Amino acid sequence: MKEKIRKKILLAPEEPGVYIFKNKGVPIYIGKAKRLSNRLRSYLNPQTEKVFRIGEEADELETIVVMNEREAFILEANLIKKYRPKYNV
Ligand SMILES: [Mn+2]
Ligand SMILES: [Mn+2]
Ligand SMILES: [Mn+2]
Ligand SMILES: [Mn+2]
């Protein structure tokens, strides 16, 4: 995983949000979190091959802090529908 992405993960706040792993400007995975810090840190110790792939292929991680878990739910759904990222089912 790129060092800048590891740094971004380790700095992420304990706040609800949506995250977007990207490569060459294109989203490759979009997810949401009750706490960005907790969810993103899980990518450092990959529990599945898919989590490993997302974290290796990405050249960028964007995070969006949201107002609450309701906003995380709808924003994540909207962005997955918009971008249909390769690793989202
Ligand atoms: Mn999701
Ligand atoms: Mn597996
Ligand atoms: Mn960007
Ligand atoms: Mn709420």
Coordinates of C-alpha atoms and ligand atoms in Angstrom, one line a residue:
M1 CA 0.0 0.0 0.0
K2 CA 1.3 3.5 -0.8
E3 CA 2.8 5.2 2.2
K4 CA 0.5 8.3 1.8
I5 CA -2.6 6.0 1.9
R6 CA -1.3 4.3 5.1
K7 CA -0.8 7.8 6.6
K8 CA -4.3 9.0 5.6
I9 CA -5.7 5.8 7.1
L10 CA -3.9 6.3 10.4
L11 CA -5.0 10.0 10.6
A12 CA -8.6 9.3 9.8
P13 CA -11.1 10.6 12.5
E14 CA -13.4 8.6 14.7
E15 CA -16.3 10.1 12.8
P16 CA -19.0 8.7 10.3
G17 CA -18.1 9.0 6.7
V18 CA -17.7 7.6 3.2
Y19 CA -14.4 6.6 1.8
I20 CA -13.2 6.2 -1.8
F21 CA -10.1 4.2 -2.9
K22 CA -9.1 5.5 -6.4
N23 CA -6.6 4.6 -9.1
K24 CA -5.6 7.1 -11.8
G25 CA -8.6 9.3 -10.8
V26 CA -11.1 6.5 -11.0
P27 CA -12.9 5.1 -7.9
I28 CA -12.2 1.4 -7.4
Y29 CA -14.0 0.9 -4.1
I30 CA -16.5 3.0 -2.1
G31 CA -17.5 2.1 1.5
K32 CA -18.9 3.8 4.6
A33 CA -18.1 3.8 8.2
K34 CA -19.6 4.6 11.6
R35 CA -16.0 5.5 12.5
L36 CA -13.7 6.2 9.6
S37 CA -10.7 5.4 11.8
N38 CA -11.9 1.9 12.7
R39 CA -13.0 0.9 9.3
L40 CA -10.0 2.2 7.4
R41 CA -7.5 0.7 9.8
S42 CA -9.0 -2.7 9.0
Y43 CA -7.4 -2.3 5.5
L44 CA -4.0 -2.4 7.1
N45 CA -4.5 -6.1 8.2
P46 CA -6.4 -7.5 5.3
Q47 CA -8.9 -10.1 6.2
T48 CA -9.8 -11.0 2.6
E49 CA -8.0 -11.0 -0.7
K50 CA -10.4 -8.3 -2.0
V51 CA -9.4 -6.0 0.9
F52 CA -5.7 -6.8 0.0
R53 CA -6.3 -5.9 -3.7
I54 CA -8.1 -2.7 -3.0
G55 CA -5.3 -1.4 -0.8
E56 CA -2.6 -2.4 -3.2
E57 CA -4.2 -1.1 -6.4
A58 CA -5.2 2.3 -5.1
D59 CA -3.0 5.3 -5.7
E60 CA -5.3 7.6 -3.7
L61 CA -7.8 7.5 -0.8
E62 CA -10.4 10.2 -0.4
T63 CA -12.5 10.5 2.7
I64 CA -15.8 12.4 3.2
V65 CA -16.8 13.1 6.8
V66 CA -20.6 13.2 7.1
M67 CA -23.1 14.5 9.6
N68 CA -24.3 11.1 10.8
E69 CA -24.8 7.5 9.9
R70 CA -28.0 8.2 8.0
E71 CA -26.1 10.5 5.7
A72 CA -23.3 7.9 5.3
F73 CA -25.9 5.3 4.2
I74 CA -27.4 7.4 1.5
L75 CA -24.2 9.1 0.3
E76 CA -22.4 5.7 0.0
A77 CA -25.4 4.3 -2.0
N78 CA -25.5 7.3 -4.3
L79 CA -21.8 7.2 -5.0
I80 CA -21.7 3.5 -5.7
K81 CA -24.6 4.0 -8.2
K82 CA -22.8 6.9 -9.8
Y83 CA -19.4 5.3 -10.2
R84 CA -20.0 1.5 -10.1
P85 CA -16.5 0.9 -8.8
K86 CA -14.7 -2.3 -9.8
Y87 CA -14.6 -3.8 -6.4
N88 CA -18.2 -3.0 -5.3
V89 CA -20.6 -5.8 -5.9
Ligands
MN1 MN -20.6 -0.7 1.6
MN2 MN -10.3 -15.3 1.4
MN3 MN -8.7 13.4 -5.3
MN4 MN -28.7 10.0 12.8

